[model samples]
Target: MEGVLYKWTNYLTGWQPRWFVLDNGILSYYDSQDKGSKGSIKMAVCEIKVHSADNTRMELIIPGEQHFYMKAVNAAERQRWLVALGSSKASLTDTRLVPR
Candidate 1:
C-alpha cells in the first residue's frame, strides 16, 4: 500500500503530509514519492495501535525506541492501511515461527 498520509513531525509542525510505502513487512515514508525515505518501521517488530480519539489516526511504536504517528485522509483510508499493516505483521510473524 502506498499513498499520502499525515505524519506527526513535532510539536511545532504537528502533522505533515508524507508519502508512505509498505512492502515486505516494512513501512517506509518519504517527503514525497520521489524523495529518499525519511524513516521506516518494521512491522515485524513494532506495535500497531489505533488512536483513542481519532478515527483517521494510528501509530506504530517500537517500545521506548521509536514511534511513527500517522493519520489518513479519512476513516476508510485508515481501514485500508490497518488491514495492510495487520496482514503484513501476521505474515512476518508466521515466517519467524514456521521456519520455512
Candidate 2:
C-alpha cells in the first residue's frame, strides 16, 4: 500500500459507525488507440462504508472498484493532516461544550 498527504478543506460534517451504500461510477481513458484494442472501461455500481469523523479527524470508506486507489490516496492524505497537526506544536485537551 502507498500513501500521500492532503489537507482538509472543511470541518468534519458527520460520522457513521457502519458501512453504507455508495452509488458511483468510474471511468478510465486511453490514448494511442490500436484499432482492435481496448479504449475505455467503466466500473459497476458498488457499496462502501462511512467511517468516523470529528472536527479534527475523519475517515472515508472506499468502495470495491476503486478501493485500492482510494486507500492509497487516503493513506497519504491522512499523513498530511498529521504533519500539519504536529508542526503546529499543539496538544489536544479534552473539554466539554455546552450548546447554547
Best by lDDT: 1
Candidate 1 lDDT over residue span 1-100, tens digit each: 9998999989999999999999898889888998468888888888887745679998888987887788999999999998988854542222223456
**Candidate 1 segments whose C-alpha is farther than 4 A from its true place:** 88-100
Which tens-of-lDDT digit does each residue in 36-78 have in candidate 2? 3222223333222223343233322234433311221354454
How do all models score by TM-score? 0.78, 0.20
RMSD in angstroms between candidate 1 and the native structure over all alpha carbons? 9.3
Q: After superposing candidate 2 on the true structure, give the runs of residues whose Cα lies further than 4 Å from its correct spot.
A: 1-76, 95-100
Q: What does the lDDT come to for candidate 1?
A: 0.83
- The 10-residue segment of model 2 with minimum total lDDT is 14-23
